[PDB]
Amino acid sequence: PHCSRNPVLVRGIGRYSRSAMYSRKALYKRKYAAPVLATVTKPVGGDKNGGTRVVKLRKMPRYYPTEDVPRKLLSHGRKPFSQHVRKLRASITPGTILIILTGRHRGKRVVFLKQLSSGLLLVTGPLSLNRVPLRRTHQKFVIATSTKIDISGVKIPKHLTDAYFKKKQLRKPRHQEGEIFDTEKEKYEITEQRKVDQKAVDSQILPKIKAVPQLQGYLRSVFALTNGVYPHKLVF
Amino acid sequence: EPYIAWGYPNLKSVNELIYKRGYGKINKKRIALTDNALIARSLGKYGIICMEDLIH
Amino acid sequence: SGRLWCKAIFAGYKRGLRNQREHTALLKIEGVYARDETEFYLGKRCAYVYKAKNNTVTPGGKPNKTRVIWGKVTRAHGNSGMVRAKFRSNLPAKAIGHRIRVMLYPSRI
Amino acid sequence: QVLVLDGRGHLLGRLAAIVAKQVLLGRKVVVVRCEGINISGNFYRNKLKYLAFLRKRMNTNPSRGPYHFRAPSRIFWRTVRGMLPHKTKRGQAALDRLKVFDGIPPPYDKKKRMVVPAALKVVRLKPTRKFAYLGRLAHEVGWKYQAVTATLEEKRKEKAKIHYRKKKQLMRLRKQAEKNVEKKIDRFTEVLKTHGFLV
Amino acid sequence: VLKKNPLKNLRIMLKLNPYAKTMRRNTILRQARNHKLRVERAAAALAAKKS
RNA sequence: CCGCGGCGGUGCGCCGCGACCGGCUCCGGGACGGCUGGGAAGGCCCGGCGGGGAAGGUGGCUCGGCCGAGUGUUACAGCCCCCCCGGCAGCAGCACUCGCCGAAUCCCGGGGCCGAGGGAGCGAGACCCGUCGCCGCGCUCUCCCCCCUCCCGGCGCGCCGG
RNA sequence: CCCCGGAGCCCCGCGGACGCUACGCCGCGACGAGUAGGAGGGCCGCUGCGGUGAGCCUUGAAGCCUAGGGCGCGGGCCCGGG
RNA sequence: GGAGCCUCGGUUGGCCUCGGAUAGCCGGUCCCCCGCGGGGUCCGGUGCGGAGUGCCCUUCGUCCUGGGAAACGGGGCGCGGC
Numbered sequence: 001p002h003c004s005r006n007p008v009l010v011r012g013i014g015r016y017s018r019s020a021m022y023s024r025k026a027l028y029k030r031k032y033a034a035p036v037l038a039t040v041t042k043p044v045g046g047d048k049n050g051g052t053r054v055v056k057l058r059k060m061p062r063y064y065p066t067e068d069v070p071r072k073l074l075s076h077g078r079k080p081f082s083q084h085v086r087k088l089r090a091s092i093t094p095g096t097i098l099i100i101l102t103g104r105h106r107g108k109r110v111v112f113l114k115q116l117s118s119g120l121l122l123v124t125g126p127l128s129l130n131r132v133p134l135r136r137t138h139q140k141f142v143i144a145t146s147t148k149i150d151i152s153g154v155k156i157p158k159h160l161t162d163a164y165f166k167k168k169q170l171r172k173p174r175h176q177e178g179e180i181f182d183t184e185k186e187k188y189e190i191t192e193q194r195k196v197d198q199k200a201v202d203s204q205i206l207p208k209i210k211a212v213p214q215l216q217g218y219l220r221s222v223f224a225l226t227n228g229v230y231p232h233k234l235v236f
Numbered sequence: 237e238p239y240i241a242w243g244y245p246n247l248k249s250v251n252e253l254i255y256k257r258g259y260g261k262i263n264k265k266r267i268a269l270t271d272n273a274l275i276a277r278s279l280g281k282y283g284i285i286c287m288e289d290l291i292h
Numbered sequence: 293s294g295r296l297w298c299k300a301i302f303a304g305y306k307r308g309l310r311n312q313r314e315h316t317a318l319l320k321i322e323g324v325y326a327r328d329e330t331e332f333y334l335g336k337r338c339a340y341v342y343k344a345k346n347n348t349v350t351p352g353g354k355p356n357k358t359r360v361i362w363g364k365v366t367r368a369h370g371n372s373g374m375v376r377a378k379f380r381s382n383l384p385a386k387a388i389g390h391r392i393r394v395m396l397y398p399s400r401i
Numbered sequence: 402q403v404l405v406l407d408g409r410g411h412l413l414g415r416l417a418a419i420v421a422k423q424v425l426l427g428r429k430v431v432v433v434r435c436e437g438i439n440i441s442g443n444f445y446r447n448k449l450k451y452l453a454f455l456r457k458r459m460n461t462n463p464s465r466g467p468y469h470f471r472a473p474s475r476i477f478w479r480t481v482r483g484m485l486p487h488k489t490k491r492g493q494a495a496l497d498r499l500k501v502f503d504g505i506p507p508p509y510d511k512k513k514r515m516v517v518p519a520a521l522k523v524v525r526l527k528p529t530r531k532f533a534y535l536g537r538l539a540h541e542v543g544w545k546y547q548a549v550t551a552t553l554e555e556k557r558k559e560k561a562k563i564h565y566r567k568k569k570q571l572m573r574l575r576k577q578a579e580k581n582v583e584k585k586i587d588r589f590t591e592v593l594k595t596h597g598f599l600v
Numbered sequence: 601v602l603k604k605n606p607l608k609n610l611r612i613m614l615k616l617n618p619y620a621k622t623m624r625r626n627t628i629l630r631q632a633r634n635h636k637l638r639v640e641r642a643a644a645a646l647a648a649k650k651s
Numbered sequence: 652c653c654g655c656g657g658c659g660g661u662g663c664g665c666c667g668c669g670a671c672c673g674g675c676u677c678c679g680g681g682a683c684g685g686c687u688g689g690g691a692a693g694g695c696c697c698g699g700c701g702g703g704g705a706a707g708g709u710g711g712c713u714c715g716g717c718c719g720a721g722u723g724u725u726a727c728a729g730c731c732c733c734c735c736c737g738g739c740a741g742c743a744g745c746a747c748u749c750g751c752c753g754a755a756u757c758c759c760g761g762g763g764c765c766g767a768g769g770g771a772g773c774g775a776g777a778c779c780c781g782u783c784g785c786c787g788c789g790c791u792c793u794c795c796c797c798c799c800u801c802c803c804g805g806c807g808c809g810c811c812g813g
Numbered sequence: 814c815c816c817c818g819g820a821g822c823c824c825c826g827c828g829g830a831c832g833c834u835a836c837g838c839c840g841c842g843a844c845g846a847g848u849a850g851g852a853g854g855g856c857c858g859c860u861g862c863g864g865u866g867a868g869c870c871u872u873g874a875a876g877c878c879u880a881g882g883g884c885g886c887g888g889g890c891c892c893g894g895g
Numbered sequence: 896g897g898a899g900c901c902u903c904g905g906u907u908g909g910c911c912u913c914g915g916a917u918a919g920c921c922g923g924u925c926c927c928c929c930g931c932g933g934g935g936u937c938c939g940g941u942g943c944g945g946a947g948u949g950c951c952c953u954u955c956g957u958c959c960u961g962g963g964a965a966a967c968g969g970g971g972c973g974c975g976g977c
């Protein structure tokens with residue numbers, strides 16, 4: 001199961017050729033000179049008197065609807081989200097600083113930790129400083145400030161992934177009708193694993209941030225546009 | 237003259253016009269030259285069997 | 293704790309002299325006056341934000357009297373840093389010469 | 402949130418043009434010292450031009466007909482009114498933002514007031530060209546209150562000269578203060594000139 | 601059939617004219633080759649300036 | 652009933668993302684051709700040959716402290732310029748953007764916008780589905796080796812064995 | 814080198830739509846100003862007749878009115894309430 | 896101090912010389928004149944204006960404790976007089 005014997009030159013253009021590839025792959029020397037009725041297909045079981053019984057796995061249906069929709073047309077190149085390729089603004093590098101633009105943690109400043117599987121950012125404005133925990137964000141609702149901490153050698157937990165940072169509650173039936181059922185439940189509880197994860201990560205960062213003078217105080221502060229200062233003019 | 241602009245096209249011009257806006261007349265139906273099977277079917281009796289031949 | 297949106301005035305609709313094409317707002321973004329200063333603002337979310345008699349809902353909030361019409365700055369309109377917008381509904385005309393908020397948050401920065 | 406523009410040294414229509422668009426974009430504007438607005442073209446030229454405008458009246462009942470305002474403030478208002486769609490609701494709303502004054506009265510006599518340099522005489526005219534003060538013009542066409550407006554402005558300039566002297570006095574002490582303190586603001590003052598002020 | 605524009609859509613170009621592949625394989629390589637050779641001139645000019 | 656397993660149509664209401672294609676409008680990079688086989692330029696300097704403005708000059712006068720500044724004349728070169736012979740690699744339509752025309756002599760990457768509009772499965776003991784053309788490749792049914800090393804296994808973070 | 818009452822199917826000539834009111838259904842192109850005027854189609858509309866709806870109707874017909882719900886490009890139409 | 900219809904716009908402030916433009920701004924006067932200032936001369940600084948609206952002022956998380964530099968500043972819609 002060898003890798004790709006020609007590399008990529010451009011998306012869709014291999015470096016080599018047809019002819020170089022014939023020689024590389026060596027098509028010379030790799031020449032392959034090669035010149036129901038009664039028996040039931042897929043049923044079968046056991047059983048007592050009379051003899052054995054022939055069942056039928058996947059038995060034809062007990063209701064047809066009166067009309068139903070008729071197929072589609074194959075359509076070529078339409079991958080599900082999981083199989084997508086993930087981008088990242090070059091500005092956003094690990095241990096950089098963001099300004100989170102949208103949520104409740106709005107205008108708050110933050111440190112960027114990693115791009116998760118999803119394509120979301122993982123983020124921490126060390127809970128301690130900012131009041132921003134280990135948290136997902138989107139590239140698109142974040143301003144990649146030109147300010148970096150050196151975060152190279154911090155072992156972020158392998159177990160913290162997209163799958164963990166994912167909302168949890170609510171199933172279907174229960175009592176339902178009346179003045180009850182899951183309008184209560186009430187609170188997302190923080191849990192202890194979550195608190196342990198934070199504790200571990202922050203300690204590795206937290207010394208690193210402090211080394212930079214005033215940086216903690218910067219990371220405490222909140223961003224906002226005052227008079228006379230225009231996004232397009234200033235830099236971050 | 238005062239109804240047209242005209243002159244001597246480049247090589248690139250003949251390509252860009254043919255590839256981007258090359259439409260056959262095929263049973264009097266303007267049809268886009270999506271494959272050479274179209275060009276050939278019509279012009280193949282002249283030795284013209286592909287977009288490239290057409291351009292030449 | 294402060295303002296996370298750049299100010300802009302609703303100039304009026306994209307229009308010829310004598311045919312206004314109501315489906316496209318024009319937006320005089322504050323502090324920008326060159327078809328040059330305005331590549332920042334292309335494709336940013338923007339809100340006509342206004343309040344009305346009856347109460348409404350509110351995302352992550354209790355029922356309010358404020359309402360908004362969301363839109364998007366599409367392209368730069370003529371030399372002096374006006375900008376075209378397009379809104380999920382057309383803007384009211386009541387709106388002329390009033391604030392609309394151009395956000396930061398489809399950022400490419 | 403409000404423009405105050407010292408109409409002195411500006412050009413009548415040139416300023417009015419710029420004011421109109423500000424006013425149409427919801428900007429509340431105030432235009433002050435309107436008698437000081439000055440109009441290109443030699444004096445006599447413009448007097449006749451006004452006197453013509455006076456002649457325009459509704460023959461059968463002048464009481465209806467085009468009301469020729471004398472005061473420089475109202476004149477300037479008239480010319481700004483000529484660049485808005487003032488028959489519309491939005492046009493009428495626009496003018497309601499604009500606020501014009503002969504001389505400079507009490508809210509704005511202690512406000513810093515801007516200057517539109519694109520309407521300014523020193524820039525927009527050749528120096529050998531002639532022009533008219535809209536005051537003189539207003540005076541001769543019947544404006545009653547030139548002298549009053551002059552006598553009130555001499556007070557204001559005297560009142561202001563005092564303020565400036567005290568302002569200067571603070572500035573001077575502040576220049577002294579920094580020098581008194583410049584070893585215990587030294588590693589602040591250094592950082593405010595790495596990122597490029599104080600130079 | 602939808603007309604995919606050959607000049608943007610590589611594989612449509614190839615469908616209509618397969619010799620494109622080679623023509624474009626050349627003129628990536630060719631341009632890289634020459635770009636390298638420009639850096640090499642520039643390095644020799646800097647070395648000549650240092651000498 | 653729990654499986655939200657497999658397929659099919661759906662979303663109560665308001666939202667957002669993602670990647671793919673179409674049509675646009677921009678941005679940034681690079682690589683080439685042709686010319687008066689570009690014109691000017693730069694850099695190194697050497698040997699000559701004249702002509703001009705006008706000079707470290709001189710001179711009348713003036714203005715300042717022999718020196719500096721301002722006019723005026725004959726004009727060599729000790730400020731330059733110009734022509735003519737003869738010769739060097741650094742040029743290159745040159746980021747020292749001084750003046751073009753282009754691209755089988757042309758490619759790469761990026762951003763904003765609008766749009767998705769169609770539906771080659773209605774079998775009774777064996778798919779509720781692929782896919783046509785094109786790209787190549789990639790792989791394998793051929794052996795080799797090298798490297799890195801993710802999982803796992805072993806040995807001392809280092810080394811050895813998908 | 815064998816038979817589809819079974820090759821398992823991208824093509825199948827052994828039998829054939831979910832589709833086929835053949836005045837139906839489906840696909841590709843192109844095009845679309847209009848007086849006078851002409852022609853076509855109107856499951857547009859009015860009143861009466863032969864047929865036909867085992868139609869509807871005092872458990873409420875026709876008409877009338879309706880800031881009720883919809884359909885149709887439109888002529889118009891259908892439902893809710895009074 | 897409490898509720899409760901309605902109408903909306905807003906989403907840091909700027910508390911000021913006069914003016915000139917083939918000129919201005921600031922200092923300081925050793926010296927002189929006028930009513931701490933005003934006017935003068937002289938000198939010293941700036942002048943594509945940094946005593947700059949290309950500007951200035953203001954900060955934008957809350958608290959805890961326990962050091963340093965800075966330190967008598969702030970408040971009680973604190974209270975009376977000029």
Ligand SMILES: [Mg+2]
Pocket residue numbers: none
């Ligand atoms: Mg017609």
Ligand SMILES: [Mg+2]
Pocket residue numbers: none
């Ligand atoms: Mg007719």
Ligand SMILES: [Mg+2]
Pocket residue numbers: 358
């Ligand atoms: Mg509000």
